[PDB]
Amino acid sequence: PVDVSVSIFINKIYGVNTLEQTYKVDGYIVAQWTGKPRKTPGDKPLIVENTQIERWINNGLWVPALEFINVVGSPDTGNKRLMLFPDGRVIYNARFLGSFSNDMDFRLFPFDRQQFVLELEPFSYNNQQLRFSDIQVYTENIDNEEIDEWWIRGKASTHISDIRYDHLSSVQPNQNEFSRITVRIDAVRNPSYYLWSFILPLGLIIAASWSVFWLESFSERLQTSFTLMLTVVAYAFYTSNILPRLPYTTVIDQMIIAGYGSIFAAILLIIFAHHRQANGVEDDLLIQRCRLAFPLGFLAIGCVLVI
Amino acid sequence: PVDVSVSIFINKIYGVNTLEQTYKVDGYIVAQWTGKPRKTPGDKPLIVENTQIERWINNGLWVPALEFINVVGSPDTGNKRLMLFPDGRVIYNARFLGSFSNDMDFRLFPFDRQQFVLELEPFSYNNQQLRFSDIQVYTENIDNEEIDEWWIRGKASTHISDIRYDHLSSVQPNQNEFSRITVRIDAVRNPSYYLWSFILPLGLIIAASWSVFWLESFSERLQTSFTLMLTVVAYAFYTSNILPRLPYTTVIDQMIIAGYGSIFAAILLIIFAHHRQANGVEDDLLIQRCRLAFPLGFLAIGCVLVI
Amino acid sequence: PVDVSVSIFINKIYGVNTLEQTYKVDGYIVAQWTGKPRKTPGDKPLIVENTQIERWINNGLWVPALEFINVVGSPDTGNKRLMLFPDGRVIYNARFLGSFSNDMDFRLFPFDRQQFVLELEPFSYNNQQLRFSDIQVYTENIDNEEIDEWWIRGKASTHISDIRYDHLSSVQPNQNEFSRITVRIDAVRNPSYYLWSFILPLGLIIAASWSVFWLESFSERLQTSFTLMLTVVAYAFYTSNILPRLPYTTVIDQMIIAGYGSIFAAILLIIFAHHRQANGVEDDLLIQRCRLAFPLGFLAIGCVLVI
Amino acid sequence: PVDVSVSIFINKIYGVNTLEQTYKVDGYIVAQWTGKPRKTPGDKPLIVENTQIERWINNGLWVPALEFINVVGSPDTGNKRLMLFPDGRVIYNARFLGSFSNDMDFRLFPFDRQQFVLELEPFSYNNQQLRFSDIQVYTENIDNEEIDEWWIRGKASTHISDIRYDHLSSVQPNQNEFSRITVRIDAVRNPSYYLWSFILPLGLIIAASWSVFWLESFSERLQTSFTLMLTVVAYAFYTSNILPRLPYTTVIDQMIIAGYGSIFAAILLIIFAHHRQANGVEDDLLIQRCRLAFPLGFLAIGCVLVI
Amino acid sequence: PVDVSVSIFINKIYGVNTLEQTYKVDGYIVAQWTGKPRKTPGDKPLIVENTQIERWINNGLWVPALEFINVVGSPDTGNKRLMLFPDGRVIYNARFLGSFSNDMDFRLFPFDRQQFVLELEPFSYNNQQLRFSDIQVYTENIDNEEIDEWWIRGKASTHISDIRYDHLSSVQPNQNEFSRITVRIDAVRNPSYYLWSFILPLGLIIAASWSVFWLESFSERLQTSFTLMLTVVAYAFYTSNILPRLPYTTVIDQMIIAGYGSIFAAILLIIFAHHRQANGVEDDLLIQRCRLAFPLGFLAIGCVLVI
Numbered sequence A, B, C, D, E: 001p002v003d004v005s006v007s008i009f010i011n012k013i014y015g016v017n018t019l020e021q022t023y024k025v026d027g028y029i030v031a032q033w034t035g036k037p038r039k040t041p042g043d044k045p046l047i048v049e050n051t052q053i054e055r056w057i058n059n060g061l062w063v064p065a066l067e068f069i070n071v072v073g074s075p076d077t078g079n080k081r082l083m084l085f086p087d088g089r090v091i092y093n094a095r096f097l098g099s100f101s102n103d104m105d106f107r108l109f110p111f112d113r114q115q116f117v118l119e120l121e122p123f124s125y126n127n128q129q130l131r132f133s134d135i136q137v138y139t140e141n142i143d144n145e146e147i148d149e150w151w152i153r154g155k156a157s158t159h160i161s162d163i164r165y166d167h168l169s170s171v172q173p174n175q176n177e178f179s180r181i182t183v184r185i186d187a188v189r190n191p192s193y194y195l196w197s198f199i200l201p202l203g204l205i206i207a208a209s210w211s212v213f214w215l216e217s218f219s220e221r222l223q224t225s226f227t228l229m230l231t232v233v234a235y236a237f238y239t240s241n242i243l244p245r246l247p248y249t250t251v252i253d254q255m256i257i258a259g260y261g262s263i264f265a266a267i268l269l270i271i272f273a274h275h276r277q278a279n280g281v282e283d284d285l286l287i288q289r290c291r292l293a294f295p296l297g298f299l300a301i302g303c304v305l306v307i
C-alpha cells in the first residue's frame, strides 16, 4: 500500500447555507507519496503545472484521485502542480473552493455551535493509505472576530480511519476498506447582532404589550389589543424575512409565538373581566389589575422555554 | 444483449424546487458488465481514472453512456473510474450531482408526501439490458429527522422495465425498446415548523377576529374590523413571501381566504344589526350577540375544508 | 442540397421569465440525412457517442451544426450520438436544455395565453434543407394540469420555411436563404391560484372600503379612510412582491389602482358632505348616504376596465 | 496592416443591472479579411465549423482574436464558423451572448435614457485595422414597444477610431495604437408602469395626507398624523423593494422624502396651532385652516424639484 | 532567479458582497521576463493567442503560473496572448475577472472606507522573483462619482515582498519564500443615498415620536405609543431588507434600537405620570411635560453613540 501524507491549508470558511446544511471552504490541498526514483533535468526536482500534468499521466505517471467525500458538486479547482523529486518523491498541490456538507443543528439559534468538516478518501484505490494529516488553519483565534460571523474554537482536529464499503466490488475479493481523512473545525456563532437587533426589541414589544392592562376603559383595552396583534405579525414578518431559513423553530421563533399567545390570553382575560360580574359594566376589580400577574406569569412560562 | 447491473448509492436528497417540481440528488453510480477477457499488468485488475477513460475509449474500449431520463440539465459528474478485470469484468463508477424532475403535488401542504425518483436508460443502445438494480440509500430511518426537512419512508423501491420508443429509428427494423431502471424513494414533509409558526398564529388571529362582537358600540365594532382586515393582509404577505411558491392554493392559503371571508361577513352583519330595526340606533339585540354563531359556524365551514 | 429531417421530442417546458420573455425547454433533437454508403463493422449500423463524434469529424465526417435561432445563451447539451448506417443514413441525436426567447404579452395576466416556440436553422449552410419536422410533445392534454402551472393546447404546430439574410455573404453570390424549422406550442395559464388568493381578497377589501359610508360620525369616516388607505398599500406591496415583474400594468395592477382611487374619492366626498351645507356640522343628508352610489358607480367604472 | 471589416447583428438587448451598470446583448459577429489565395475542394469556398477551426489554426491559419473591450466576463459564444474562399477571402462568424458595461445615469428615473454600447478591439494586433463597421439592429422601431421595457431610438451609430495604449509594449517601438469599433444604441425607458403604479398612488397618498387639516379636534389631527407617517414608511418599503437598486436618489425617492417632510411639518403646525394662543384649547383659527397653504405651498416646493 | 515584472490594468471594481467580504475586479494582467533568444519568422516578435499557447508549452516554452492569492474561486480569464521577442523577451497578457477577498469592516456604515486589494504570487516557483509592479487604475479621481457607488482615493499603492511558507516542501531544502505583489486601492462609500433616504427619515420618525407628550389625555398618549411602536418595526423591516446584510450592528441599526428604546421609555413615563400621584387621574403636572427632557436627553445619549 502506498503511503500518502496530506496537508490541508484552510484559507476561508464562509457562506453557510442553513437550509442545505452546507458551507463554502477555500484552501489548498497537498498530497505526498514516494515512487520509483527518476531522472530530472539537472538533478533538481521538476515542476509540472496545470495542463502539463495530464501529459505526464498519459506517459505513465501515477497521480491518484483524491475525493472530497462530503463536497456537494465538483469543487472549483484552480492551479495544480506536481513537484517531482529525482529520488522519487512526488508532491501534488492544488487550490480548491468547494461546498461542503455536514449535519447541522440550528435549533439553538443565535447561540448555535457548528463544526465545519472535510472528508477525504481516495476515489478508486482501497490499496493505498493515508499516512498522516496536517491542517494549517492559520487564520487566528482571538483577533478579528467581531468583524467575522463565526468564531473558531481552533485549531482543527484530525482523524485518519478506515471505512468499509460492503456493496462495492474491489480489486481483490477480500479488500474493501478505504483510507479516510476527516478534519473538524469547531465554531460558535457571533450572537451580538441578533441579541441587540432582534431579541431585545422583541422583548420590549412583548413587555409593552402588557401595558394594555393599565388602560382605563374596556373598549380601550380590547381595541388596543388588535394593534399589538398587528405589531407581532409585522415583527414575525421582519424576523422571518431576515433570519436564516430553517425547517424547524428557533428560540426567536418561540418568543414570537409567545408574544402571539400573551396577546391572545390578554384578549381572553380583558373580555372575561368585563362579563364576569353582576350588572353590565362592572369590570372585575382585582383581575383587570393583573398588571403583574401576566409579566411574571410569563417570565415563569418563559423560564420553561429553557427546561 | 449485454447484461449490465447497476448499483446507485444516494448520499443526499435536497433542494426541492416546488415551482419547477425538481429536487437535487448527490450520489454514486456503479455499472458492471462482462466483455472479452484482457491482459492486465501483473494479473491484477486495472484501474483507470477520469481523463484516462477517454483514451481507452479511443483505442476501442466500449463504455456505454447511461442517461438519467428525468434529470434537468447535464448532471455535474465528479470523478469517474473504470475497473478493468483480466477475466473481462468492467466496472464503471462515477460521482454525480443532478437536478431531477418528477410530478409533484404540493396541494396538501405542510403535510404533503412526495417521491423522489431516478430513471436510468442507456442513451443509444436498445440492444443492451439492465440485469439488476440495487440502491444503497444508507442514510438511515429513525434518527436525525427533526434536524432534516424531509423524512424518508425507506428503503427505496426499484423496478427494471422496457420502454417503447415508437418514433425513434433503431439499429434493426424491429427492435425499438429500451431497458429502464426506475428508483423511488418515498418521503413525508416535516410539518412541525409550519404548524407552530404559521397555522397556529393564523388560528389565534382568526379567533381573535371574532372577539369583535364583544365590543359595545357599533362604531367600535365596524372600525375595529378594518384593522383586523389589515392584519389578515399583513399575514397573507408574510405567509406568501416565506412559504414555497405554487401555482395553486394550499391548505394554509385557504385558511387565509377564510380569515378574509369571516372578517367580511362580520362587517356585513355588524352593519346589518345596526339598520335592521325600527328607529335609528337599536342594534338588533340577539344578532349583535352571535359571539358563538360565528366561531362554530366557522368551525362547521371549517370542517368542510376537509371533505 | 442535402435533405435533413428533424424530430424534436419535448420533455419539459418550465421556468418562464416574464421580464426577459424567456422560458426553459428540455428535450431531444434528432436529425437525419443520407450520405455516401459506408463500411461498418459486421454490417450492422455503427453507434458513436459523445467525445467520439469529434474524432469522426476530424477524419472527414460531415455533421452540420444546427442552431436554435431563439435560444438565449449556449444551450446545455447532454449526451449526443451519431448512428451510422452502412447504406449511408446518418442520424444525429442529442439531449438539450436551453433558455428560449419569444415575444410575450402578459397584459391580460392571470388569464394570459402564450406560445412557446423553437426556431431551428443550420448555422453555416444555406446549401442544405430541412425536409420535414415532427415534434413529439407526448406529455398529454387533459390530465395533470391542476398540478401544473401551464395548460397546453397541443399538439405543437410546425413550420418549415426560408429565411433571407440580405447582409450575410454566402458560398455563392446568388444563394442567401436559410431553411428554418419553427415549432409552436400554445398554452394558457392556470388562473386558479390568482383568482382565489389575489383577485378575491382584493375585491373583499375594496368592497369593505365602501362600508365607510355607514359610519355615523364625520370624524369616524375620515379617520377610518386613512386605515383603508394603508390597507391598499399593504396589499399593493404584497401583490407586487409575489406576482411576476412586468414593465406594464396587469388587470390586478388596475384593480389596485381603482382601490386607491375609490378610497381617495371617498375622502373627497366625506370632506365635501361635511362642508357643503349652511351651519357647521350639517352633514349633507342625501350624500353621506351614497352607500349605493359608490358600490355600483364603481361596478360601472369597473365594467369599463373591460372595454 | 490587414483590413478587417465587421458586421454586428444584434438580436436582443435585455437584463439591465442598475447597480453594476451592465446589460446583456445577444447577437452575431462577422469579421472579414483577405489573405493568400488557397486551394479548396472543388473550387467552392470551404466551410469550417466549431472544433475544426482550432485544427486549421494549428496548421497555420491566422484567425485574429477580437475582444469586446467593455464585456464583463468571458462572453458565452455559441457556434462559430470560418468560410474560406479560394481567392483568399476569410469570413469569421460567431453567435455571442455577453454582459456589457457602460456608464449609466439612472438619476432621472422612470424617465431615463441610456445608451447600450459595444466596443471591439483586436486583442493582440495593433498592426491590423478595422476597415468598416455595420450593425444590423433589425429589430424594429415603432411596433411592439408597450410589450417591451426599453424603446430604441434606432438605428445604431458606429465609429471606428484609434486608441493609444501608452503602457503596453508592442511589436515595434513606435506603434502602440489599436483599431477600435464602437457601436451605440440609444434607448428610452417605458415609463408607463411606474407612472400608473407608483407615481400616481404616491401622489394620492401625499394629497390625502393634507386632508388632516379638515379634522375638527386637535387630538384627531395629531393622532391621525402618526398613521399617515406609517403609511409613507410602508410605501417607501414597497417602493424600495420593487424599484431598481441605485447608489443615489431618484425622482420617486425624492417624492417619498417630500411625503415624509410634509407629514412632519404638519405635525409641527398642528402642535403649534394648539399652543400659540392665550388660554388652553384656543386652536389658532386662521392657521389650523391652512388646508390650502400646504397643498400649494407643496406644489411650489414641488416645482423646485424640477429646477 | 528569473526577474518578472508585472503591470496590472484595473478596468472596474464592483459587486461588493458585505457578507462574504468580497468584491469583483475586471482588468488585464501583463507579465514580462527574459529568456534564451529565439528565432522568429522575419525577425519581428511573434504573437501567440489563446489555444496556441498550450501548444508552445508542450514543445517546451516556460510560462509560469501566477496565482491571485486572494481570489475566491477560479477567475474568469478571457483572451490571453504571448508576445515572443527574438532577443528573448516574453510578454504574457490576459484579461481577467475575479472575485477577490479582503478583511472588510462595515461597522461605520454609510460612512465606511474600504481597501480593494489584489495579491499575486507565483503558484509553484519560489525560485523566481517579481522585479517590479505597476498598476494603471486609469479610471479617474474627481469626475463621475455621484454616478458611482464608491469613490477612489487613488492611485493604487504597490508592494513587492517575500512570504515564508513554513509547511510547504520546496525544490531545495533551504528555499521556502515566495515573491508576492500586493496592490491596494483605497475607497470611501458614497453616503448620499443613505443620508437622505434612510438616516433623515429615521430622524423625523424618531422626533415625531416625541410629540406624544403634547397629547392631552393619558389614554391618547399610551394608545398612540403603540402606533409609533409599529412604525419603528415597519421601519426596521424596510431598513433591513434594503441595506447590506452584516453580522454586526451599523450606526443605522443603532438609531433603530434607540427609536425602540425612546418609545419604550415613553410608555414607561406616560404610565408612571398617571399613577404617581394622590387620587386617580392626577397626571403628574411637571412630568407629563417632559416635552423637552426627552428630545435633548436623547440628543445627549445620542452624542454618546459617537464616543
Ligand SMILES: CC(=O)OCC[N+](C)(C)C
Pocket (backbone or CB within 6 Å): A067, A121, A122, A123, A124, A165, A168, A178, B009, B028, B029, B030, B093
Ligand atoms: C459507493 C461508492 O461509489 O464509492 C466510490 C468512492 N469512494 C470509494 C471514494 C467512496
Ligand SMILES: CC(=O)OCC[N+](C)(C)C
Pocket (backbone or CB within 6 Å): B067, B121, B122, B123, B124, B165, B168, B178, C009, C028, C029, C030, C093
Ligand atoms: C427521444 C429520444 O431522443 O431518446 C433518445 C434517448 N433515450 C432512448 C435513452 C430516451
Ligand SMILES: CC(=O)OCC[N+](C)(C)C
Pocket (backbone or CB within 6 Å): C067, C121, C122, C123, C124, C165, C168, C178, D009, D028, D029, D030, D093
Ligand atoms: C446573422 C448571422 O450571422 O447568421 C448566421 C447564423 N444563421 C444564418 C443561422 C442565422
Ligand SMILES: CC(=O)OCC[N+](C)(C)C
Pocket (backbone or CB within 6 Å): D067, D121, D122, D123, D124, D165, D168, D178, E009, E028, E029, E030, E093, E094
Ligand atoms: C491593457 C491591455 O492589456 O490591453 C490589451 C487588449 N487591448 C489592447 C485590446 C486593450
Ligand SMILES: CC(=O)OCC[N+](C)(C)C
Pocket (backbone or CB within 6 Å): A009, A028, A029, A030, A093, E067, E121, E122, E123, E124, E165, E168, E178
Ligand atoms: C499553502 C499553499 O498551498 O500554497 C501554494 C501556493 N502558494 C505557494 C503560491 C501560496
